[PDB]
Amino acid sequence: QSLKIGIVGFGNFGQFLAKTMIKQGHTLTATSRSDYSELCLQMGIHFFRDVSAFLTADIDVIVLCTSILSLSEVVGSMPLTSLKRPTLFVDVLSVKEHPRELLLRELPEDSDILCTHPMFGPQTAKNGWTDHTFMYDKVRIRDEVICSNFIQIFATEGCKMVQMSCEEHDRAAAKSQFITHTIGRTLGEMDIQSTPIDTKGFETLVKLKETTMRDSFDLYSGLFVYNRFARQELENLEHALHKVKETLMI
Amino acid sequence: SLKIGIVGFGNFGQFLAKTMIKQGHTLTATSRSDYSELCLQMGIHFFRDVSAFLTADIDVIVLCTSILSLSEVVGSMPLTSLKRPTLFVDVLSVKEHPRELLLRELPEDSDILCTHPMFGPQTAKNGWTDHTFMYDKVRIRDEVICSNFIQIFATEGCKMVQMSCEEHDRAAAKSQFITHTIGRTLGEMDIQSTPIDTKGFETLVKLKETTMRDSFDLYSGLFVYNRFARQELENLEHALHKVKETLMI
Ligand SMILES: NC(=O)c1ccc[n+]([C@@H]2O[C@H](COP(=O)([O-])OP(=O)(O)OC[C@H]3O[C@@H](n4cnc5c(N)ncnc54)[C@H](OP(=O)(O)O)[C@@H]3O)[C@@H](O)[C@H]2O)c1
Ligand SMILES: NC(=O)c1ccc[n+]([C@@H]2O[C@H](COP(=O)([O-])OP(=O)(O)OC[C@H]3O[C@@H](n4cnc5c(N)ncnc54)[C@H](OP(=O)(O)O)[C@@H]3O)[C@@H](O)[C@H]2O)c1
Ligand SMILES: N[C@@H](Cc1ccc(O)cc1)C(=O)O
Ligand SMILES: N[C@@H](Cc1ccc(O)cc1)C(=O)O
């Protein structure tokens, strides 16, 4: 079940995924806006600076690891008629309705589509993926063997496997992940600092701030701009805070 | 071994009593509501009337009533009936208020130790080790009795932090008050675990659950009686507004 995997977008998270893929024995190719030639040499990954050359490589699965905000531009730049054979496309964006809609619209019809979200990354799964959650939606799967072998990348690492529609993911993510990152960035803007008398609860907010601020602002913007349920959750958070505040006035 | 009397035998008074009894101190309690059966079960004497509590043989009185009620509670106590100088300890989650109130209202010859265990039944269910205990020796003349009592927390492995009541309230406004405001906010949102919780969201769900175990009175006291809390609420509100603005454009 060893795969030839091509990563599009070899940034923070693409690198994180590649480390575990290499550990399992997969054969990796990568392409990206920026030049990762030296890092790919270190890791044994075949890097293509040009996406046209990448698309003609011997690849079983293409994994889209670019930012949510850039996905449309990146897919638009792909000469998808250069694809040598029907290929499974996987995305790992943190929102799901958008890539599902875009890939259904832009990809060749005979390319399969697996829309996924590993609910973890470099800050929470440094030391392994065990008992972290991996979400997927089999948007357009006809070659079940290749789809199963890819999904098994996360199952063998002990991930909790969750099959769910892209819409149900975005509904749940707006209420959970988006709220969490919003609070983390709020604490970052406050620049909360440890004191000599931190409660355990506050220590957990300091660490949440620290971990949240490791992610790019692009990523946070994508969580809001491309999740149609995020706006209501932002309102719910503000509405809740003002309800609490007004109890203090009264 | 100390004769310790608890005033306010609620949630946190009961929590402190458990450990104080384990250490071999002799506990008595009094309180607005009746705790006769609970004190029977725990093996300590409950006084329904604060007057009989105050004329007992007692080394330390620990004020474990809500921040909001401290003034009414102290005002109702017939403090001149104390048989001898007695150490008063408060464990309120804010400090400038009890310091100023006790200095004003207590008999001059009673000592005052203002403290804040930075923990409670949710975060220290299984022991006090490496939890922080703040104290300010506001008016100590009997250093032996004060050192005993302080040792209650030291022997449990607490991180012992001496610091002024004002410096406590400045730091607490920035830390505890902010944390509990966020917890209450998540309580009003009624945030719920999903099949795809991130680890960070799991931490917020637990913060919500832990925060909602405390009384609204307690939360209200963190704000009303910490003169530094209002600006920290502003800092939180202003920061969320700034985060929202980065999204709305
Ligand atoms: N814990 C995580 O970070 C995590 C977890 C799960 C899922 N995800 C998702 O994984 C993806 C990558 O996340 P990330 O943490 O690496 O950070 P990110 O800031 O969301 O994305 C960084 C990647 O996006 C590329 N990129 C950004 N703008 C681009 C543009 N105009 N044109 C072409 N490429 C562009 C970058 O390319 P270059 O590096 O070549 O410049 C880089 O590879 C995102 O979709 C994210 O939502 C992240
Ligand atoms: N983890 C914690 O909960 C924690 C940790 C550190 C410090 N503290 C501080 O410990 C103290 C007690 O906290 P708590 O958790 O037990 O909850 P709390 O709601 O702040 O206070 C409960 C106590 O206040 C008494 N009380 C409330 N209103 C009263 C009134 N008008 N008149 C007379 N007594 C009144 C209650 O008496 P009855 O029960 O008899 O009705 C009860 O004993 C507070 O000052 C708190 O700030 C709490
Ligand atoms: N990067 C953080 C948080 C995160 C998780 C999932 C995401 O899709 C985005 C961010 C982590 O490693 O856990
Ligand atoms: N009751 C919670 C939070 C708390 C801590 C200290 C306080 O003063 C008040 C509340 C705990 O056990 O930690």
Domain count, chain A: 2
Neighbours of B173 (CB within 10 A): 22
Angstrom distance (rounded) from CA A82 to CA A2: 24
Dihedral over Cα of A175, A179, A181, A184: its sign: negative
For residue A250, the chain B residues in CB contact (below 8 A) are none
Q: How far from the centroid of its chain's Cα atoms is residue B121's Cα? A: 11
The data reach a resolution, in angstroms, of 1.7
Ramachandran region, residue A95 (left: φ > 0; alpha: ψ -120 to 50; beta: rest): beta
Please give the full DSSP string across chain B, using - where no structure is assigned. Answer: --EEEEE--SHHHHHHHHHHHHTT-EEEEE-SS--HHHHHHHT-EEESSHHHHHTS--SEEEE-S-TTTHHHHHHHS-GGG-SS--EEEE--S--HHHHHHHHHHS-TTS-EEEEEES--TTT-TT--TT-EEEEEEEE-S-HHHHHHHHHHHHHTT-EEEE--HHHHHHHHHHTHHHHHHHHHHHHHHT----TT--HHHHHHHHHHHHHTTS-HHHHHHHHHT-TTHHHHHHHHHHHHHHHHHHHH-
Which of B94, B134, B182 to substitute to test the interface with A, most A CBs within 10 Å?
A: B182
CB contact under 8 A, B118 and A248: no
Which residue from A119, A149, A151 is spatially nearest to A138, judged by alpha carbons?
Answer: A151
How many other CB atoms are found less than 10 A from the CB of residue B129? 10
For residues B75 and B73, give the distance between their C-alpha atoms in angstroms, rounded to a whole number.
Answer: 5
Residues of B in contact with A237 (CB under 8 A): 185, 189, 240
Do B195 and B103 have their domain in common? no
Q: Which residue of B has its CA nearest to A234?
A: B244
Nearest C-alpha neighbor of A117 from the set A53, A45, A64? A64
Do B189 and B93 share a domain, yes or no?
no
Q: Which of A207, A185, A183 is closest to B189 using CA atoms?
A: A183
Nearest CA in chain B to A246: B220
Closest approach of chain A CAs to the CA of B114, in angstroms? 15
For residue B226 and ligand 4, the question of a CB distance below 6 A is answered with no
At which of B163, B179, B198 does a domain end?
B163
Q: Which residue, A130, A129, A133, is CA-closest to A176?
A: A133
Contacts of A179 (CB under 8 A, 6+ apart): A233, A237, B189, B191, B201, B204
Rounded to an integer, what distance in angstroms lies between the CA atom of residue A30 and that of residue A15? 10
DSSP A24: H
A197 vs B161, B196, B220: nearest CB: B161
Please give all residues whose beta carbon lies within 6 A of any atom in ligand 2, as ranges.
B 8-13, 31-33, 64-67, 69, 72-73, 91-93, 117, 120-121, 214-215, 217-218, 221
Q: Quick one: B28 and B142 in the same domain?
A: yes
Task: Name the token pair of B94.
Answer: 């804010």
Q: Say yes or no: A156 and A97 in one domain.
A: yes
Q: Which ligand is nearest to the Cα of residue B176, counting in written order? A: 4
The residue whose CB lies within 8 Å of the most ligand 4 atoms, and thus the one to mutate among B91, B97, B176, is B176
Distance CA A86, CA A239 (A): 49
Residue indicated by tokens 């790919």: A40
Task: Locate the ligand 2 atom nearest the alpha carbon of residue B118 and give its number.
Answer: 6
- To the nearest whole Å, the CA of A10 is away from the closest chain B CA by 23
Mutation choice for B interface testing from A68, A187, A237, A244 by most B CBs within 10 A? A244
**Co-location of B180 and B224 in the same domain:** yes
Cα–Cα distance, B129 to B189 (Å, whole number): 33
Q: Please indicate if the annotation marks A165 as binding a ligand.
A: no
Taking CB atoms and an 8 Å limit, are B203 and A208 in contact across chains? yes
**CA-CA distance, A178 to A218, in Å (whole number)?**
13
In angstroms, the CA A31 to CA A140 distance is 24
Give the whole-angstrom CA distance, residue A240 versus residue A220.
21
Pick left, alpha or beta for residue A9 (phi over 0 → left; psi -120 to 50 → alpha; otherwise beta): left
Are A132 and A171 members of one domain? no
Residues B192 and B146 in one domain: no
One-letter amino acid identity for A45?
Answer: I
| Ligand closest to CA B210 | 4
Here the tokens at position A111 are 């390319």
Chain A hits for B67, CB-CB cut-off 8 Å, are none
For residue B129, CA distances in Å to A231, B62, B156, B234 come to 43, 21, 6, 34
- Whether B84 and B173 map to the same domain: the answer is no
Positive or negative torsion for Cα B23, B29, B35, B36? positive
**Of the residues B105, B129, B163, the one at which a domain ends:** B163
How far is residue B189's CA from residue B186's CA, in Å, rounded to a whole number?
5
Its sign, for the CA torsion B236, B238, B240, B246, is negative
Give the CA diameter of chain A: 69
Pairing of β A160-163 and β B3-7: unpaired
| Residues B80 and B6 grouped into a single domain | yes
- Give the neighbor-by-neighbor strand order of the sheet with A61-64: A46-48, A27-31, A4-8, A61-64, A88-91, A113-118, A133-140, A160-163
Which residues of B fall within a CB distance of 8 Å from A234? Answer: 244, 247
**In a shared domain, residues B52 and B174:** no
Distances from the Cα of A36 to the Cαs of A32, A45, B220, in angstroms?
Answer: 8, 10, 54
Structural Rg of chain B based on CA atoms:
20
Ligand whose nearest atom lies closest to the CA of A68:
1
Q: What are A112's two structure tokens?
A: 């399969």
* Inter-chain residue contact A241 with B185, CB threshold 8 Å: yes
B102 alpha-carbon distance from chain centroid? 15
Task: Provide the phi-psi class of A128: left if phi over 0, else alpha when psi is between -120 and 50, else beta.
Answer: left
Q: Are A233 and A155 found together in one domain? A: no
Backbone dihedral region for residue A158 (phi beyond 0: left; psi -120 to 50: alpha; all else: beta): left
Asked whether the beta carbons of A138 and A163 are under 8 A apart, the reply is yes
| Antiparallel, parallel or unpaired: β B3-7 and A4-8 | unpaired
From the alpha carbon of B222, which atom of ligand 2 is closest? Answer: 47
Residue-by-residue DSSP string for A213-246: TTS-HHHHHHHHHT-TTHHHHHHHHHHHHHHHHH
**Nearest CA-CA distance, residue A51 and chain B, Å:** 31
The answer to whether A7 touches A17, Cβ cutoff 8 Å, is yes
Measure B167 CA to nearest chain A CA, in Å. Answer: 10
Per-position b or e across B91-108, b if 16+ CB within 10 A of its CB: bbbbbbbbbebbeeebee
Provide the experimental method for this PDB entry: X-ray
Q: Helix crossing, B229-248 with B165-174: angle to 10°?
A: 20
Distance CA B1, CA B26 (A): 7
**Closest C-alpha among B157, B102, B105, B109 to residue B131:** B157
- Is B186:B208 a contact under the CB 8 Å cutoff? yes
Q: How many Cα atoms occupy the beta-carbon half-sphere of A56 within 13 Å?
A: 6
Residues B67 and B187 in one domain: no
Instruction: Find out whether A94 is annotated in a ligand binding site.
Output: yes
For ligand 3, which residues put their CB under 6 angstroms from it? Answer: A 94, 119-124, 211, 215; B 198
A1: tokens are 């079940």
Q: Indicate the residue among B163, B191, B217 that finishes a domain.
A: B163
Closest CB to B188 among A183, A190, A244: A244
**Is B183's C-beta closer than 6 angstroms to any atom of ligand 4?**
no
Amino acid letter at A149?
N
Domain hosting A110: range is: 1-164
